[PDB]
């Protein structure tokens, strides 16, 4: 960390490291959105 | 000599010169002023 590793914090033997990360959340609600469309209905012409 | 070479003394026919020189002094007391600071502590970042 740049702002927390000051010249006075390092002089007391304090040096700071930042570890940011993201967990793997459990997919407890997998949503599926089904739609019936007529976009590829003209695909049965050739 | 600036303060002695006058116009009234030029008629006397006696002009004045000065030979000054600064002699090399022996270093009989070589002091060292060593200090510990915290100026370059932020240099330890990358």
TrEMBL record, chains A, B:
Q: Which chain regions cross the lipid bilayer?
A: none
**Membership in a protein family:** Belongs to the myoviridae tail sheath protein family.
Identify this protein by name.
Probable bacteriophage protein
What is the organism of origin for this protein?
Answer: Pseudomonas aeruginosa (strain ATCC 15692 / DSM 22644 / CIP 104116 / JCM 14847 / LMG 12228 / 1C / PRS 101 / PAO1)
Residues of the whole record sequence present: 339 to 384 of 386
